[PDB]
Ligand binder design. Structure first.
Ligand SMILES: O=C(O)C1=C[C@H](O)[C@@H](OS(=O)(=O)O)[C@H](O[C@H]2[C@H](O)[C@@H](NS(=O)(=O)O)[C@@H](O[C@H]3[C@H](O)[C@@H](OS(=O)(=O)O)[C@H](O[C@H]4[C@H](O)[C@@H](NS(=O)(=O)O)[C@@H](O[C@H]5[C@H](O)[C@@H](OS(=O)(=O)O)[C@H](O[C@H]6[C@H](O)[C@@H](NS(=O)(=O)O)[C@@H](O)O[C@@H]6COS(=O)(=O)O)O[C@H]5C(=O)O)O[C@@H]4COS(=O)(=O)O)O[C@H]3C(=O)O)O[C@@H]2COS(=O)(=O)O)O1
Ligand SMILES: O=C(O)C1=C[C@H](O)[C@@H](OS(=O)(=O)O)[C@H](O[C@H]2[C@H](O)[C@@H](NS(=O)(=O)O)[C@@H](O[C@H]3[C@H](O)[C@@H](OS(=O)(=O)O)[C@H](O[C@H]4[C@H](O)[C@@H](NS(=O)(=O)O)[C@@H](O[C@H]5[C@H](O)[C@@H](OS(=O)(=O)O)[C@H](O[C@H]6[C@H](O)[C@@H](NS(=O)(=O)O)[C@@H](O)O[C@@H]6COS(=O)(=O)O)O[C@H]5C(=O)O)O[C@@H]4COS(=O)(=O)O)O[C@H]3C(=O)O)O[C@@H]2COS(=O)(=O)O)O1
Lengths: 515, 516
């Protein structure tokens, strides 16, 4: 056996250093990785080690049952919406994600808000119940024995609130004072919540020990409409006046990290900083607080925040307008502020339908019903409908001029229409049902146009514009697969099963046969 | 740390293969890579240091030298070798053109293949050095005893003046059971043999061939029958018909030998490594006359005119060259019954005929080219070649299937033919071809991205028409696609041709369309 070095000429161009063993040649994975865009690592278990090679990075969702409107949303149980770079932060006023853009403010992007709600809804169904720790349940025999710290000009007393039929804390602390504080001490869970009613300006601050060396970070939830601020180790979120009773719920993990990575660009700076201990809370101003709680998760609160945001922000045409200009790419006219997205409409429908089924609150269903509005108008008339080669109706993720035909957004619009049609019943759902079934006809014919024989294409701009195919990155390919296998459980066309099979093989280096 | 290790490589959680580990680097076996990535590579020893040469593809793009025009080389066909294709059964003895293989002992005439044969020989005539040409039996013996020929008893071989032919020729007589009259040749360099011939009975001209195979020479018999091709031991037989009026027979002994040795009753001629080594002699049986016995390196124009004349003589009343075998393109397409036309056949013929007309000014070639336009005007289902993509774009079908298939390469070849014709026939007569061409070019420009996978090309649009997997084009079809676009780019200034060529070329080296 002699394992020596052999020079490898690559396409008659560059030379790299390989290995040989007689007639057999071995090529360095460090070159393969970049040349083929593939993945691998040496993984070492207890008595031996192994190189694990992977053609791609994403995985297909393992479906457990037929898809249905009131269950998990496709694969969103495994989605983490809030860690996305383009999520600037969770709004203190709205409790929903804002998207990044150029400049200090964010914009509300209904797609992102709906995905936030849908994933939290889905996780509520699949995860174990959270650990819930309630604080300040001990009743001091007198003020001196209180768990609270009440400095010089401050007040903190327990009062029976007849209207709420419970005891609450009435607090008072001048804004320049240290404020009244309650030790917390949680090292495991990072979702904080409390019932709150302010009668002046003030704030609730949470002191956070972190993996960063030095002083703790402090997150201030203040009675302003300010989005988010970072100054040294002080992070600030405006939560509004809070002059009527509400339950405030905050993910300290997300709030901390979005604060640290705050910038005026399209991408939040990634941080490896993690919370280690929720130290205490500090209150300034006057009002009342109750039910101070730290939980592992609080999924339904986030779901309803998204659902209620959607109800409140739907416009008179039934749409959620994207209030920034979007320029999809060279060849496509800019979309001016106020444009709709078929994906936004559909994802909103899926969220609203679920909220309606949980509560029986008609306003969720009415909102979903109105959302079909833009589907009936062409892209150029402030709608979402495109037509492929004068023949096939399509619902646009981006209603561009000329049309773009993005696959994944189209399918999400169909899932949304399905959720609606199935839930509204025969009479009220006919409209959504008609739009759905017509879209499904288009999808079944057009699907092969997105198949490259080793992956999928994102959209049809190569054909519409006369340019290179806009290939889908692996996790969009994985979205396509998850989407088709979902449809496969609610529509028996062989096209979905045949396409799912072949598209899955692409993840494992499979390809269509050549002649 | 670890300095050399046979390491388990788990591939996508399925199979396990053996790599090598050396420090932080892992090396993977090319024997797996080759089949897994569908790539190519070989160890090439250099004088001093040998090297592994890796390639993403095979095949090359043609290096064009000038703007394309109708009387010059045909695309890249100067580098084509049509005769060695496994599906060329042989060169017909009667017609001097290739027959295609099929199931059974027979072959059929395939106009695409015949046109490509002519076009490549035409192109080689323009690019290769002129052949060496050796004429035999030019010496005039003073008497019969001193003849260069061997004349066994009961046979005769005399030089006579042939008045009609206005030249001196050899008159032969040799019974079929005899050894025949023979003439030594002795050529070790060149293997295209030709002779002027006129039989007055049944007989044959046989050529004794020494080869790289050990044992006795092979003998090729050119006999006065219409039999296609025979093999028995070292005798290969071709029927060349009656030959009762004077003609020039021209045979490629290299091709004739190999097709003989590899003779089968299947779709695929068996490959051989046997090569001719020496043309020993020719032997003649029967009665008749022979003249101008010659061996040349090449005889390109003879092959070109054989192809051109076949096209003229075999075009039907509707201007088409009908394919007389059934072709079943694949699952989902109806069988094409005998008699179907092909846009590629029509166009490749136009390109050949136009070239024949420009060399000779013989109107028969231009008329045939002009009429070849017929099938383009009729839908596939009505014995034509026209398909329509999504109710909008006219297309000319290499395979006029039901439903339509939209093969890219055959379409473009049909366009090149229409161009050749439109450019050659003039304004008035060429109007028809000109219209078909420009209508097809408009379709091509719109539909072209449908064939682009972001890393290769698709052969046709069956994936969309049938709802199935894309039928990916193998590398030498991808390379045809590129060659065709760069040709069109010299006669049409649309940026689409340039942009697509540039990207499609990058695919050959592992380039790809960007993903999001
Ligand atoms: O959570 C998940 O794991 C997850 C997975 C799934 O993918 C998906 O879930 S699903 O269920 O919906 O399927 C979902 O994806 C989210 C991502 O995880 C998340 N990534 S993040 O990094 O964590 O934030 C995110 O992704 C978006 C990001 O912007 C970015 O991600 S990243 O990893 O690359 O950083 C990525 O951007 C893509 C973009 O999608 C491509 N667009 S295209 O239409 O497909 O071609 C693309 O856009 C480029 C163009 O190339 C460029 O054109 S140009 O010709 O080169 O110039 C153009 O430039 C614009 C310029 O930006 C314009 N600004 S504007 O006016 O404000 O619109 C203007 O200046 O004009 C230029 C064009 O001018 S021109 O018309 O004259 O030509 O746009 C840029 C562009 O960045 O937009 O290529 C980029 C990659 O860029 S790069 O890094 O290679 O340079 O993917 C984005 C995306 O997928 O949307 O957000 C995902 C959705 O999350 S959420 O919003 O629903 O919460 O989650
Ligand atoms: O000289 C060159 O270098 C050169 C390069 C360029 O490529 C080209 O030049 S250009 O300027 O025109 O561009 C030109 O190419 C020639 C080749 O070099 C030459 N190769 S050769 O080996 O030297 O002879 C030759 O190529 C043809 C050969 O048949 C073959 O080549 S090989 O290397 O594979 O041996 C190859 O066949 C392909 C074929 O093209 C594919 N067709 S497809 O439409 O693209 O999908 C394909 O056909 C298969 C199908 O997969 C099969 O379908 S099935 O679903 O699997 O069953 C189907 O089976 C039929 C059956 O054959 C039928 N018989 S029939 O009734 O007589 O029609 C019937 O039984 O029904 C079945 C279908 O039933 S069903 O409807 O129910 O489904 O057809 C077969 C089939 O073989 O036809 O896949 C094969 C590869 O097969 S395999 O080996 O992987 O198994 O390529 C052929 C081709 O390209 O035409 O000839 C080329 C042109 O030369 S010439 O004629 O102009 O002189 O030169």
């Amino acid at each position: 056996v002699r394992y020596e070095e052999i020079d490898c000429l690559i396409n008659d161009d560059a030379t790299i250093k390989g290995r040989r063993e007689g007639s057999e040649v071995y090529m360095p994975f460090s070159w393969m990785e970049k040349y083929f865009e593939v993945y691998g690592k040496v993984v070492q278990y207890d008595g031996y080690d192994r190189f694990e090679f992977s053609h791609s990075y994403s995985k297909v969702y393992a479906q457990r049952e037929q898809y249905h409107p009131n269950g998990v949303f496709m694969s969103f149980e495994g989605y983490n919406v809030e860690v996305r770079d383009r999520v600037k932060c969770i709004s203190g006023v709205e409790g929903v994600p804002l998207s990044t853009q150029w400049g200090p403010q964010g914009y509300f992007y209904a797609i992102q808000i709906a995905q936030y709600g849908l994933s939290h809804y889905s996780k509520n169904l699949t995860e174990r119940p959270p650990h819930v720790e309630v604080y300040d349940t001990a009743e001091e025999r007198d003020s001196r024995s209180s768990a609270w710290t009440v400095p010089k000009g401050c007040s903190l007393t327990r009062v029976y609130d007849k209207t709420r039929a419970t005891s609450v804390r009435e607090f008072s602390a001048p804004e320049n004072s240290e404020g009244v504080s309650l030790p917390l001490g949680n090292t495991k869970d990072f979702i904080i919540s409390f019932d709150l009613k302010f009668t002046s300006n003030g704030s609730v601050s949470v002191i956070l020990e972190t993996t960063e060396k030095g002083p703790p970070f402090v997150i201030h939830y203040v009675t302003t409409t300010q989005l988010i601020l970072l100054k040294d180790r002080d992070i600030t979120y405006g939560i509004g006046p809070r002059t009527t009773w509400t339950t405030v719920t905050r993910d300290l993990l997300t709030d901390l990290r979005k604060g640290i990575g705050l910038s005026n660009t399209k991408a939040v700076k990634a941080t490896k900083t993690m919370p280690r201990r929720v130290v205490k809370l500090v209150v300034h101003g006057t009002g009342t607080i109750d039910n101070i709680t730290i939980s592992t998760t609080s999924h339904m609160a986030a779901f309803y925040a998204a659902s209620d945001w959607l109800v409140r922000n739907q416009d008179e045409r039934g749409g959620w307008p994207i209030m920034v200009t979007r320029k999809l790419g060279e060849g496509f006219r800019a979309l001016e502020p106020g444009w709709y997205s078929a994906m936004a409409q559909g994802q909103a429908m899926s969220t609203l339908v679920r909220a309606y089924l949980m509560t029986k609150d008609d306003r969720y269903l009415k909102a979903a019903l109105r959302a079909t509005g833009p589907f009936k108008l062409p892209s150029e008339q402030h709608g979402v409908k495109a037509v492929f080669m004068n023949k096939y109706d399509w619902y646009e993720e981006y209603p561009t001029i000329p049309s773009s035909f993005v696959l994944n957004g189209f399918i999400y619009s169909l899932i949304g229409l399905f959720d609606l049609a199935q839930t509204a019943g025969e009479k009220l759902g006919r409209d959504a049902g008609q739009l759905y079934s017509k879209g499904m006809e288009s999808l079944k014919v057009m699907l092969p146009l997105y198949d490259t024989g080793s992956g999928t294409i994102y959209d049809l701009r190569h054909f519409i514009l006369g340019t290179a195919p806009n290939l889908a990155r692996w996790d969009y390919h994985t979205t396509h697969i998850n989407q088709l296998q979902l449809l496969g459980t609610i529509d028996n066309s062989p096209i979905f099963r045949d396409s799912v099979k072949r598209w899955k093989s692409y993840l494992k280096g499979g390809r269509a046969k050549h002649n």
